[PDB]
């Protein structure tokens, strides 16, 4: 299986499936196997990775869909990341 490494501004290294990371057109362009994000800290990028897993699992599925949870304290930063990543 092909994995890629996404690195947060504080040096946390997140290893995810390549297919999952291609959810983002921005990440695809940065690849085309490691990407550094200078403006995205780990408490945000970890959530981004969890969104990829959630999306791939529940897209085109029958089983009832649960809400994607976002704590108030990270919502503003997560919004800015999602805008940059187009996801």
């Amino acid at each position: 299986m092909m994995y890629v490494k996404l690195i947060s501004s504080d040096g946390h290294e997140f290893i995810v499936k390549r297919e999952h990371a291609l959810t983002s057109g921005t990440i695809k362009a940065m690849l085309s196997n490691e990407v550094n994000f200078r403006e995205i800290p780990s408490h945000v990028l970890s959530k981004v990775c969890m969104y990829f897993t959630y999306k791939v699992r529940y897209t085109n599925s029958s089983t009832e869909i649960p809400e994607f949870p976002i704590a108030p304290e990270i919502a503003l930063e997560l919004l800015m990341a999602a805008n940059f990543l187009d996801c």
Partner: protein, 104 residues
């Protein structure tokens, strides 16, 4: 049934899934393909508890309704350098700032 995991050591975090019926040892083979260290140089943990190779992830408390895609369960990881194993160390994620006033 699929379980969704974060496998964590120091500042490394791997997102992956596995079967509830799969074994601890089989999860080490997954880590081996990604980080290039064999099973005999790996220890896996749930919180502070060392996991035995022969046990299933289900037996050890990773079940499909607690290890969810949007909220995966954590498995700790320690490597052996030379003769002995390092202690389990997982660096915490960064802290969010204060909520702005207009969000209170």
């Amino acid at each position: 049934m699929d379980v969704f995991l974060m496998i964590r050591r120091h500042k490394t975090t791997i997102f992956t899934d596995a079967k509830e019926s799969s074994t601890v040892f089989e999860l080490k083979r997954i880590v081996e393909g990604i980080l290039k260290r064999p099973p005999d140089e790996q220890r896996l943990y749930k919180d502070d508890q060392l996991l035995d190779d022969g046990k299933t992830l289900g037996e050890c408390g990773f079940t499909s309704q607690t290890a969810r895609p949007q909220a995966p369960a954590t498995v700790g990881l320690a490597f052996r350098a030379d003769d002995t194993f390092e202690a389990l160390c997982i660096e915490p994620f960064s802290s969010p700032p204060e909520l702005p006033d207009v969000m209170k």
